[PDB]
Amino acid sequence: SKIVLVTGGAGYIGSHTVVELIENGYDCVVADNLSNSTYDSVARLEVLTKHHIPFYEVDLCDRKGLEKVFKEYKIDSVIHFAGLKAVGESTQIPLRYYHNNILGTVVLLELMQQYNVSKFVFSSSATVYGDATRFPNMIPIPEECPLGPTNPYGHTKYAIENILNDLYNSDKKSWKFAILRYFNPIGAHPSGLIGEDPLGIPNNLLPYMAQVAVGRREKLYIFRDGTPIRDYIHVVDLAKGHIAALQYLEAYNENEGLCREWNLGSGKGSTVFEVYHAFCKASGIDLPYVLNLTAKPDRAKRELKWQTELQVEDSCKDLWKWTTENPFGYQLRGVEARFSAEDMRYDARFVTIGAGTRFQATFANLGASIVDLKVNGQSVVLGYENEEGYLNPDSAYIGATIGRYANRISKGKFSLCNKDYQLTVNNGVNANHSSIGSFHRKRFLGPIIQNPSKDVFTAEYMLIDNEKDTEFPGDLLVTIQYTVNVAQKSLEIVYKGKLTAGEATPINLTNHSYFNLNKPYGDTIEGTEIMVRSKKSVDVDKNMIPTGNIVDREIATFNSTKPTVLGPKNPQFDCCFVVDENAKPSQINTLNNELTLIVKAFHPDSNITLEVLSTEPTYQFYTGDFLSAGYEARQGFAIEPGRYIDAINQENWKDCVTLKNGETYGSKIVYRFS
Amino acid sequence: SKIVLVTGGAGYIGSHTVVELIENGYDCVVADNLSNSTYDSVARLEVLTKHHIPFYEVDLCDRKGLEKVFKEYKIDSVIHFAGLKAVGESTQIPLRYYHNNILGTVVLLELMQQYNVSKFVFSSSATVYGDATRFPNMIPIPEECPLGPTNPYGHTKYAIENILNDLYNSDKKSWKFAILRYFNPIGAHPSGLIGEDPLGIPNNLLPYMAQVAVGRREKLYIFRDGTPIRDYIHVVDLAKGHIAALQYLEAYNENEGLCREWNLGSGKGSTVFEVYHAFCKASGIDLPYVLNLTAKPDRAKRELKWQTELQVEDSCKDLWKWTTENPFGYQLRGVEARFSAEDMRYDARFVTIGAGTRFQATFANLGASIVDLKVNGQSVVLGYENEEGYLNPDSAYIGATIGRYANRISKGKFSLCNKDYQLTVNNGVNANHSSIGSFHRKRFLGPIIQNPSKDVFTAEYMLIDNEKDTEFPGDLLVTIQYTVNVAQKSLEIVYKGKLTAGEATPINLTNHSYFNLNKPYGDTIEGTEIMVRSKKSVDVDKNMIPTGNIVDREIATFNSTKPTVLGPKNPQFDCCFVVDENAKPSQINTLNNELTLIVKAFHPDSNITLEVLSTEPTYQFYTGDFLSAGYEARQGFAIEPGRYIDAINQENWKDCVTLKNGETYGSKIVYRFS
Numbered sequence A, B: 001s002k003i004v005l006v007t008g009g010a011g012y013i014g015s016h017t018v019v020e021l022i023e024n025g026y027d028c029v030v031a032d033n034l035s036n037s038t039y040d041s042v043a044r045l046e047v048l049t050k051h052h053i054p055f056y057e058v059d060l061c062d063r064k065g066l067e068k069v070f071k072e073y074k075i076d077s078v079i080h081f082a083g084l085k086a087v088g089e090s091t092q093i094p095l096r097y098y099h100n101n102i103l104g105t106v107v108l109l110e111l112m113q114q115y116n117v118s119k120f121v122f123s124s125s126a127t128v129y130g131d132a133t134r135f136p137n138m139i140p141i142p143e144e145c146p147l148g149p150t151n152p153y154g155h156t157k158y159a160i161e162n163i164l165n166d167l168y169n170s171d172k173k174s175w176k177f178a179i180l181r182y183f184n185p186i187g188a189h190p191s192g193l194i195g196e197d198p199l200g201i202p203n204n205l206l207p208y209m210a211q212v213a214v215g216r217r218e219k220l221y222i223f224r225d226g227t228p229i230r231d232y233i234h235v236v237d238l239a240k241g242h243i244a245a246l247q248y249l250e251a252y253n254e255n256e257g258l259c260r261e262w263n264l265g266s267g268k269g270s271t272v273f274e275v276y277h278a279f280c281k282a283s284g285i286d287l288p289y290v291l292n293l294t295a296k297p298d299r300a301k302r303e304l305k306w307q308t309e310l311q312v313e314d315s316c317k318d319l320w321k322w323t324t325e326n327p328f329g330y331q332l333r334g335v336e337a338r339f340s341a342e343d344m345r346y347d348a349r350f351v352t353i354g355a356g357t358r359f360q361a362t363f364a365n366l367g368a369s370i371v372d373l374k375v376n377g378q379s380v381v382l383g384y385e386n387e388e389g390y391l392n393p394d395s396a397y398i399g400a401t402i403g404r405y406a407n408r409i410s411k412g413k414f415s416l417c418n419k420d421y422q423l424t425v426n427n428g429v430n431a432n433h434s435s436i437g438s439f440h441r442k443r444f445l446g447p448i449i450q451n452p453s454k455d456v457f458t459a460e461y462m463l464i465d466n467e468k469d470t471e472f473p474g475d476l477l478v479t480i481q482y483t484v485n486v487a488q489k490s491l492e493i494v495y496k497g498k499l500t501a502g503e504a505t506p507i508n509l510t511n512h513s514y515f516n517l518n519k520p521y522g523d524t525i526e527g528t529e530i531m532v533r534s535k536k537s538v539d540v541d542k543n544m545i546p547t548g549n550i551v552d553r554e555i556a557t558f559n560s561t562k563p564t565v566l567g568p569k570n571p572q573f574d575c576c577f578v579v580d581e582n583a584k585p586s587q588i589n590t591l592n593n594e595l596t597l598i599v600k601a602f603h604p605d606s607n608i609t610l611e612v613l614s615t616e617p618t619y620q621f622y623t624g625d626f627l628s629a630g631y632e633a634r635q636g637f638a639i640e641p642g643r644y645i646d647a648i649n650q651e652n653w654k655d656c657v658t659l660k661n662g663e664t665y666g667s668k669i670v671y672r673f674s
């Protein structure tokens, strides 16, 4: 797979282009100093594209810092979007524009020269042309229109275009450069997941209109009909233009080079008002309220074989979707993040949703772990300050997503599709919690964080688990959607899994949170009152494997007069409770099943109540008697809804843990506090 | 005095401009990374302009390094010559051109912004115009000709011009910029002391021709008549154009700003051949052997009130002088230098002439000191490894220039011009060696180093000693010319002094070298054989002051059968020998007097002979019995030709040590080894 270095990749256009790149088979690495963006776009892209996107928070002007990228990955090509681009502001702080824009480019190019990277796609701008009307018949603007920027920003782009040409000319066989003159990019990815998030005050017609329609701006000011003209290009069409440029460079010989420029525009001139109207039409709202700059797009069409395919209307609808779904952009009140590994390692973060409220949930990319749950300011689960603790080799699987298969598998073996598999044995004579392939140590993509409604926050993570990398068969795609309802103090966990390749895989995920409802006071779970839905449980042998029988455990149920009180030492549980002793488990996806209340836990000293519910057939209950790795025995209790023990080897339970090609595994767990 | 920061000031044009600046009353500080020059030009400028020129070896791209300048001096204006300028090479290493040229400028400008320095004069180039013939009637080229450089170098100048304009436009009241488009500068300062020293291979018509006429190049290649056209401007006229630009900026209000450009050219187009011929004519030799680029000079003439005043012929003669006087430029075989204080402190160096030969002389700016003398590889004088040793407060004045008045002055007082002076007493009840104003601790200008002929090397230092800074009356200018003849193994020292203000000053300089002719073997001067011209000596009292009488000392003369042998302890001398006991000392300048042999010293174990000669009337002989500061007693012997003891207070000797306004003090000393 070709690796493309995308500078300024967390920004607007760059982010959209990453989508196209990944979709076209390229792998991307993003380098961005976040001067006009946040990492959130990148995190969202991971999920949207179903690919990890290595990210470097770096200023291109920092040679040492940028060199690491070239040392860490074999870069095949670079698309350079990084830069300052506010024309207005450029007139005011020209030195910063030139320093940032020119120096960043030169450093990047010097490293490429050094690392022998020859392919470069540059974000130029129609601003290089200046006022084309200074010439006759220059509208629409051809690539050949003489350059003459009229603002510092344009000046910087013009300088960069010359550096490129000069550089190619200096070693014609070692450089393949595509200079792309963008016109006015507008719009958002149709999914509504990413868009332009102007960190400050929209300088642009569009983002500014949008901020108005959403009350972020009181009113918008309109600055042939009366209105200055532009060529509004859908950011998706623009992004695709980059893929066309890359292929063009790719057509050239290893031994050959080139330097050429292309306008990337629709060729359609738009009347500000015309836009307004398109927008108002799109948003269903009435906002308040150089001559021309239209591209001649013939060269790109003929040479790059590219042309816009979307309309201003599409740009408007798409922008409107992104806007309505994210009125305030990526940054959200009630959402906070911190590093959980090395400074600046963005894919190693602890993100808290419901931050500053009576119900705060922290999740980690690592194991899509539930790092903490705070109810009324009090933490109710066990966890570690950083990834280091989670990564202990003597794991108790605290707060983790367990996958692909929770609990025990007899002797680590199973057969499927008439093929016999052997998993690494790690617990007694069996493989527990999928041993070496445990999700608890795997790093998930994302997250995508939303605040869809008052008091509601969501976090979605994804995991790509390829056959080639595990003892299990098949390429599995997993998604985890966490929904935090602050008003109800509830956490909903929805698992989905699907094979992208392979005939089938055993699957049985869960969350291994360990609760402790009395942290402020108290060295153990002692004092906790427990009641479960029913005593019916999976009978097991000396090796924790099912005997085939179903027996009662001695524990309180919801109808008992008194609850089971957990003492400092006893009672001790480590068993699988059955929801319906009758049930003939047939479903790979329980998402539409009833959300059954399975466990009630209460601590009289903190007065907190926890209820766990699940659409799953069984639930493991464990008193943390064997708690290690930083904790001691009985410091927390686990409740893991799922599918029996060794189901894969059990005649009557195997189908419900067998994910076949074409189907979707689904499971839901809910924790509610009161 | 206004302080001008001259970037690239050790280079060609910059150096010439410094001359003009200092001559026009400005003080200069030079910042240069020496990428295409050596410090030697600066050292020469100090002497030529009679002013110290603080120098910083720094890359303009190094903010921290460059900031020191702004912190160290109050900069009033900046003339920025620093940059890479080889068009040819620019096409080959474009990235370096842009990085160096643009980044250097931006950093400098950002510091100026920060330090509130608003006046800037920029070295632009006619290269910004590109081919003017692309337009009709554009020759001679007006400032208004549209810019369109055709090489990377031009591109960098063009970028810089825009940064400037953009910057001024961004804060119109805080910047005063003069953009100067030079045409083809040629020539050298008429003194022949400074010129262009192309570190590598002349890219230029001129310097290349010169290297040919001097055999540095085998032949030169000629690349309306046939020949490409240019406007060859005398580097001196160019330099003066900068003073005109500065005054123009200076005419503007503190509260006002501006940005404007001027071509600096003669307006005369020159036919390559035409040049050749001018050159051949000038050099009296036959060398082997864009269309147009002539400036329209009207704007500068009208606005800056400046125009060229020299001819191509003058440029040619002047270049020819610099060439003949310095065929190899500033760098010379047999000349070496090292730092004698902090790294990179250029005015604190130890320069060796006659390096690698049988007669090597090292001098320091500090005290214009004779650091070392090596005869046949053996050091024959005492000295220190660095300035630290010379700077010891318990000085023995080792190797120093003594000034303004050597030896003792009764009670430190004297009168002159019917005015009574009091000098700080430092030796017994008298002032010895001018006490606090001693030249031994003063830092001299230069040096100017030449290798005028085979085996001959010269070093010239200068000292500006203002009344305001000393107990003596008057502003004295002193020059020291050292001449090292390797063939003869001789060192000639010529002192000259002149009052630049004031009616008169007492003056009596000398060199306080301490010899030791047997360093390889031997802890003292023991074994040295001495004979002096005559035993006649200045009789002195208990305070080392003359009694008025002349007595014989017990010491061998040249006609004695045996020499005086200096033992480990005795004999001990500390007296003033008289050359001619008869003489009525009347001369302030003895340079034309006979060079009298006064002392013969010989060491049988090293077989070295030293002869000291002088045009001076007397000579102090001292056996270093009171040697301190790192040395012990009798570790070296001094011979200091000069003018009696307390002459200034002695009726019969006072006139010869009284420098009056309008006259020139002169004294010569020679050391010859065999």
Ligand SMILES: NC(=O)c1ccc[n+]([C@@H]2O[C@H](COP(=O)([O-])OP(=O)(O)OC[C@H]3O[C@@H](n4cnc5c(N)ncnc54)[C@H](O)[C@@H]3O)[C@@H](O)[C@H]2O)c1
Pocket (backbone or CB within 6 Å): A007, A008, A009, A010, A011, A012, A013, A014, A031, A032, A033, A034, A035, A036, A037, A058, A059, A060, A061, A080, A081, A082, A083, A084, A085, A100, A104, A123, A124, A125, A126, A181, A182, A183, A184, A185
């Ligand atoms: N949006 C437009 O209308 C427009 C028009 C044409 C050309 N362009 C150019 O396209 C590119 C992308 O524009 P955009 O709209 O996505 O802007 P953007 O601000 O969203 O993206 C640019 C990104 O570069 C990053 N960045 C800035 N300086 C950097 C540095 N020194 N090192 C690393 N990262 C740095 C910023 O943080 C930002 O994420 C820019 O070069 C811009 O000039 C944009």
Ligand SMILES: NC(=O)c1ccc[n+]([C@@H]2O[C@H](COP(=O)([O-])OP(=O)(O)OC[C@H]3O[C@@H](n4cnc5c(N)ncnc54)[C@H](O)[C@@H]3O)[C@@H](O)[C@H]2O)c1
Pocket (backbone or CB within 6 Å): B007, B008, B009, B010, B011, B012, B013, B014, B031, B032, B033, B034, B035, B036, B037, B058, B059, B060, B061, B080, B081, B082, B083, B084, B085, B100, B104, B123, B124, B125, B126, B181, B182, B183, B184, B185
């Ligand atoms: N000589 C010409 O024909 C010509 C024509 C017009 C314009 N110019 C310009 O005039 C200026 C002076 O030219 P010149 O002939 O004296 O050249 P020069 O090489 O003699 O002088 C330039 C000086 O800048 C110094 N320098 C280079 N980069 C530096 C950096 N980053 N930091 C500090 N010092 C640095 C060099 O060491 C050198 O001493 C340059 O800007 C040149 O482009 C020269």
Ligand SMILES: O=c1ccn([C@@H]2O[C@H](COP(=O)(O)OP(=O)(O)O[C@H]3O[C@H](CO)[C@@H](O)[C@H](O)[C@H]3O)[C@@H](O)[C@H]2O)c(=O)[nH]1
Pocket (backbone or CB within 6 Å): A085, A087, A124, A125, A126, A127, A182, A183, A184, A202, A203, A204, A205, A206, A208, A221, A222, A223, A227, A228, A229, A230, A272, A293
């Ligand atoms: O707040 C605003 C801003 C703009 N407009 C008008 O609506 C149009 C949109 O202007 P804007 O969105 O900022 O576009 P441009 O000023 O044309 O500049 C963009 O288009 C350039 C090429 O045209 C790109 O290359 C630049 O990076 C980018 O700033 C113009 O007619 C404006 O006069 C308003 O009415 N209100």
Ligand SMILES: O=c1ccn([C@@H]2O[C@H](COP(=O)(O)OP(=O)(O)O[C@H]3O[C@H](CO)[C@@H](O)[C@H](O)[C@H]3O)[C@@H](O)[C@H]2O)c(=O)[nH]1
Pocket (backbone or CB within 6 Å): B085, B087, B124, B125, B126, B127, B182, B183, B184, B202, B203, B204, B205, B206, B208, B221, B222, B223, B227, B228, B229, B230, B272, B293
């Ligand atoms: O080795 C050489 C070099 C040049 N020439 C010719 O003689 C003239 C002199 O050329 P050169 O001295 O290098 O001058 P230019 O090429 O004209 O360039 C200078 O003049 C520019 C403006 O004209 C300045 O601004 C630049 O910094 C500087 O390189 C031209 O006709 C050349 O064709 C030769 O015959 N032999």
Ligand SMILES: OC[C@H]1O[C@@H](O)[C@H](O)[C@@H](O)[C@H]1O
Pocket (backbone or CB within 6 Å): A395, A396, A397, A407, A432, A574, A575, A620, A622, A626, A640
């Ligand atoms: O520490 C992890 C624990 O997880 C439970 O699911 C399991 O039943 C226990 O036996 C122990 O493995």
Ligand SMILES: OC[C@H]1O[C@@H](O)[C@H](O)[C@@H](O)[C@H]1O
Pocket (backbone or CB within 6 Å): B395, B396, B397, B407, B432, B574, B575, B620, B622, B626, B640
């Ligand atoms: O150490 C310096 C010496 O210099 C001599 O000129 C002087 O006569 C000595 O008395 C002593 O001062």
Ligand code: NA
Pocket (backbone or CB within 6 Å): A325, A326, A327, A449, A450, A451, A452
């Ligand atoms: Na949202």
Ligand code: NA
Pocket (backbone or CB within 6 Å): A331, A332, A333, A334, A335, A336
């Ligand atoms: Na937030």
Ligand code: NA
Pocket (backbone or CB within 6 Å): B325, B326, B327, B449, B450, B451, B452
């Ligand atoms: Na010389």
Ligand code: NA
Pocket (backbone or CB within 6 Å): B331, B332, B333, B334, B335, B336
């Ligand atoms: Na040398």
